[PDB]
Chains A and B, each alone.
With several copies, the nearest count.
Chain A
Amino acid sequence: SNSGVRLDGYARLVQQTILCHQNPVTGLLPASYDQKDAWVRDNVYSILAVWGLGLAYRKNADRDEDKAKAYELEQSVVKLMRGLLHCMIRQVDKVESFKYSQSTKDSLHAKYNTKTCATVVGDDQWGHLQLDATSVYLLFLAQMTASGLHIIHSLDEVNFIQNLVFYIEAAYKTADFGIWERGDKTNQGISELNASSVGMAKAALEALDELDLFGVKGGPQSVIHVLADEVQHCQSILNSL
């Protein structure tokens, strides 16, 4: 059929474009060019194509080959997802420090490394403050786990996600470098609030209201609890600016 030809062509294009640098074991794709780095935002955004392609395969599979193709696409997605999760869960001290007071020194690194998931730069050589990346990450995590992929295995990850929720819940009164990692309009960057981060975080907090991470086979303690006043404050701030 024509649909088979088009799906084969799209799979070939995706394979030749993005999957060739998937970097297994770690699961982190390089952030383009010969930079040897992995920006969280790009890694999160580079999976939507494979995700939609796999969902297109799943409903029309009805055959062993297409079932296997959908399986391998979903497994690649969950590999990349766990690869993102590991780098942050390795750094609980910084999020614990950030939970009290607000400062750039106690913030998560924005550029994680290749194999062994180490640090490449210190705290005084880059702008390590991007709420948008974490918020949009959690939004796609909620969407994927609502779709029906298992991403969360251990219960300690639930506690870490709950802590990260408090990590990002104060975005309506916290100044950040920005999406462009350039501070304000001119250089010599000074932290300043922007509407993009707050708007990104509002939907991220909204998505995890009751969505459990264990699917239909969860338990009494499987749902992330979120408040409501922060969402209204973010909406008011967005409407004002």
Chain B
Amino acid sequence: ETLWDKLDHYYRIVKSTLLLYQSPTTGLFPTKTCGGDQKAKIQDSLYCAAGAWALALAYRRIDDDKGRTHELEHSAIKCMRGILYCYMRQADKVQQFKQDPRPTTCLHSVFNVHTGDELLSYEEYGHLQINAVSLYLLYLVEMISSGLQIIYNTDEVSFIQNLVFCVERVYRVPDFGVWERGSKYNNGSTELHSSSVGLAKAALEAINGFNLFGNQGCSWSVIFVDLDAHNRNRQTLCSLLPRESRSHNTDAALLPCISYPAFALDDEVLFSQTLDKVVRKLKGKYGFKRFLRDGYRTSLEDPNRCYYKPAEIKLFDGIECEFPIFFLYMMIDGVFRGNPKQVQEYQDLLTPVLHHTTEGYPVVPKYYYVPADFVEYEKNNPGSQKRFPSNCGRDGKLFLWGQALYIIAKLLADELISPKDIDPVQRYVPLKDQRNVSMRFSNQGPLENDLVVHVALIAESQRLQVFLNTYGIQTQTPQQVEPIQIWPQQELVKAYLQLGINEKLGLSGRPDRPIGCLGTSKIYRILGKTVVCYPIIFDLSDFYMSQDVFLLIDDIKNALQFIKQYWKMHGRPLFLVLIREDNIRGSRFNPILDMLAALKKGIIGGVKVHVDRLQTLISGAVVEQLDFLRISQPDVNISEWKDKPTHEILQKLNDCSCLASQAILLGILLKREGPNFITKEGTVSDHIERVYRRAGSQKLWLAVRYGAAFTQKFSSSIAPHITTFLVHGKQVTLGAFGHEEEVISNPLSPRVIQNIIYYKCNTHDEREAVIQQELVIHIGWIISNNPELFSGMLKIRIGWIIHAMEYELQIRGGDKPALDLYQLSPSEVKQLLLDILQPQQNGRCWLNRRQIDGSLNRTPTGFYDRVWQILERTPNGIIVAGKHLPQQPTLSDMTMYEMNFSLLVEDTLGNIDQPQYRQIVVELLMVVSIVLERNPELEFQDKVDLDRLVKEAFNEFQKDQSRLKEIEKQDDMTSFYNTPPLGKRGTCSYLTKAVMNLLLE
């Protein structure tokens, strides 16, 4: 039998199964093959089109094809044109979502297939889904690279640009998930999904630097991408790779994100452990279940409640459905990985479960269900009973996605094609080939990091450069580089904003956002003129920490590490450094000399750096091109001077020279009269900015902080820090110690958080805004470079940290009055923050250590499993400080590693006023957990009262001191706090005595 017979068999299979139900009006396949359903999905039709394209490519190998490939190619093109037309029908939603990402403005994903219009409201489906758009873009670029023609005019290029800009911000907004249910509770909440972000990373990587018209194109067929978004996407993936979601330990949806459709996880070992875990935990006799405890279209369900009631999911376990389609995906992964043994075993497994038509055509049903007779018997022994086929397994109903994947699996299995043909963009590469790939691996090899970066020395003024030359320092004035130009970062921002404008539809282009160091590290050419920019850390900033040399040295070292670790583009990066004359300012001129001498030496903290003349470096280097533009103490107090008249405050402001008095008088004038008032020097805002800049020049930290609080200006980096804190798994609350606090559980827009923090600031204090900014940026930097330092802490509260550090400073002061924190330079505040955040050692009072640990809300490792296992072996429950935690709901709603149990136990434990009391409690809980797990014979008879135990332990400790040192009964247990938990007579001994006294009775 020649190839003609098998190819004709595949043709008749496709005609009888896939192409039979195509809609000629639109070209989109429907979700249901019977009953005249008007609902159509995006994934199914795209998969069918991909299968048809694969079959056409397979049949292309015959010169006498008789036009069969013609029909398949035009069917794929018609499907692509229909889906693009439907996407481009909705234009307002794209623009709205580009500015304010919300479910209301999300692009619709379900629409009537007869006329390409929406048929259902967004209040019943959500409609927010990005994996579909990413997969559509990936398949479209794949088909263009194959040799097909998909786009006609320039407007579609602008639409693709706007879609790329739209999907660049996927790493923050939560998604409803591939299964549309999202959380396992199915209550109406959105959670982050690793599969969507992985698909987005793959699509952004593929779309970079590609001609869209195919064979022909000069300057209007390219796509521009930002490396910063790609870096954030890869960071989010690497952080969230082990667990798909906070509420899902594992899911079956991970396979497509980490197999043929994506091919994104280039780490082998974590790929191996992930595949092993998913296979071990999701394997079934009839296929792969969606996830554990999945109540998805099972026997017990009823069609009257969209959202599941609490504790029903517990009853829903054990009766999960089986989807044999994933056997096909594993077959595909095996056949690309060159492991025939998996091919044979999986084909043998899928052989009996497959069904036949009247003519014997293969059938793959959707899901498998158990009859109502075996509802309880299957629970005792998993898999003894035999399930029953679904409705789409006998006749009249099919699953187009299923037969498409089946036929593509058979086409790959029978060797009629090769892996290269079906993947023309080399998405998958072997371990021996990953040597000189772009945007994935460096030229030095995967397990190597020895990059050399270039630096350019440019001065500002002739006086500064001659002064540096007198000491042997070589630097060049900006007037000697006339062929080259140096421009700030806002020029590139406005240039990028100019791009992506269309008049017929109405598009705002790329939003005005800051450009990262990686983007500015390149060299640009506009209007034929070379433009080079320096990092944002160098420009003038109103804030105060930019005036400290140690801050700049640490920041530039961090930037050098960042450029070293996250650079993969061909060619050495370019770094620009500018020295200012006011920086030397007399005595502080030594550290810059040391830093520049180290820079001239060649190595900066283990990083190799090369320095030479700028024109030499720019010559012989690749320059990025932008051709779009051508085509297109105080003596004044608040209370005493509050009631003074306006003329008196004006004259006092005029005749006073103290900075603090001037600032406070300006504040009184602003709060009483307003910002529009006119004073001796012009407007009130003008005086505020002028005195603020004067204080910044003179470096009065209290004055600059007060002026910055007046200016109501905020740093443009809070959002990355809050997003990274959320993605790590920690919690951050904004507020003041002893006052109201706001908890943030999901990412929010900058406007809302700014309004909340400014309202709190107006309520309580004056300089806490800038202090919180400084602490949050320092916390972000210390957690970014030293993540292990924050082990054990989950809720990061700025007020408790500032109180703890103030207490530590007061302790250090001793007899000397405690130094005010508002007058401290950034150097000592970062030093003291690192000191208090240290793991801490002995020598100091244990009460202070317990105070610091409790203020940080530190928890011991493995505490959460310990309290859960206590609860499993606590028939009644635990009451702490008036809070009740019944065992039935927590055992019937949650599981071992679920984070909701963590938040509930933390909420229960957070009512303790004294944090030292809290750490006494947590130590007692650790002790009781240990002593219980070491002996299973002894069990509790009723609920334990931790207050009772701690009080009797205090009584025993008091009796011990009374007998030993002859100390009378003293109120408060600070003496118990001072005693270390371990030693000759530690707190652990008293707690254990508590445990035995409670168990024995």
Contact = CB atoms under 8 A, between A and B. Distances in A.
A22 to B, nearest CB: 23
Given A60-B528, A62-B528, A148-B619, A216 B612 contact: yes
Interface in A28-54: none
A185 interface: no
Query: What 5 A-B pairs come out closest when comparing CB atoms?
Result: A156-B24, A148-B619, A154-B24, A216-B616, A148-B620
A89 interface: yes
A90 B528 contact: no
Contacts of B617: 216
Interface string A121-163: 0000000000000000000000000001000001011000000
A89 B616 contact: no
Contacts of A156: 24
B485 interface: no
Interface in A76-116: 89-90
A68 to B, nearest CB: 17
B231 interface: no
B26 to A, nearest CB: 10
Given A148-B619, A148-B620, A216-B616, A89 B528 contact: no
A70 to B, nearest CB: 13
17 contacts: A59-B528, A60-B528, A62-B528, A89-B24, A89-B25, A90-B25, A148-B619, A148-B620, A154-B24, A154-B27, A156-B24, A157-B24, A215-B620, A216-B612, A216-B616, A216-B617, A216-B620
Nearest to A215: B620
Greatest chain B CB density within 10 A among A60, A90, A154, A216 is at: A216
Contacts of B24: 89, 154, 156-157
Interface in A180-237: 215-216
Contacts of A62: 528
Nearest to B627: A62
Interface of A: 59-60, 62, 89-90, 148, 154, 156-157, 215-216
A156 B21 CA distance: 13
Greatest chain A CB density within 10 A among B24, B25, B617, B619 is at: B24
Contacts of A215: 620
Contacts of B619: 148
A160 to B, nearest CB: 8
Contacts of B616: 216
Given A62-B528, A148-B619, A157-B24, 11 more contacts: A59-B528, A60-B528, A89-B25, A90-B25, A154-B24, A154-B27, A156-B24, A215-B620, A216-B612, A216-B616, A216-B617
Nearest to B612: A216
Contacts of B612: 216
B524 to A, nearest CB: 14
Contacts of A154: 24, 27
Contacts of A59: 528
Interface string B16-57: 000000001101000000000000000000000000000000
A156 to B, nearest CB: 4
Interface string B503-535: 000000000000000000000000010000000
Nearest to B610: A216
Nearest to B620: A148
A90 to B, nearest CB: 7
Contacts of A157: 24
B28 to A, nearest CB: 13
A89 B26 CA distance: 11
A193 to B, nearest CB: 35
Contacts of B25: 89-90
A152 to B, nearest CB: 12
Contacts of B27: 154
Interface in B599-640: 612, 616-617, 619-620
A109 to B, nearest CB: 17
A125 B25 CA distance: 27
Contacts of A90: 25
A139 to B, nearest CB: 19
B625 to A, nearest CB: 8
Contacts of A89: 24-25
Nearest to B525: A62
Interface in B551-601: none
Nearest to A153: B27
Nearest to B617: A216
Contacts of B528: 59-60, 62
Contacts of B620: 148, 215-216
B484 to A, nearest CB: 12
Interface string B837-851: 000000000000000
A231 to B, nearest CB: 20
Nearest to B616: A216
A2 to B, nearest CB: 15
Nearest to A155: B24
Nearest to B483: A59
B219 to A, nearest CB: 11
A28 to B, nearest CB: 17
Nearest to A62: B528
Nearest to A90: B25
Nearest to A160: B24
A90 B24 CA distance: 10
Nearest to A60: B528
A3 B25 CA distance: 44
A86 to B, nearest CB: 8
B623 to A, nearest CB: 11
A89 B27 CA distance: 13
Nearest to A86: B25
Nearest to A146: B616
A166 to B, nearest CB: 19
Nearest to B619: A148
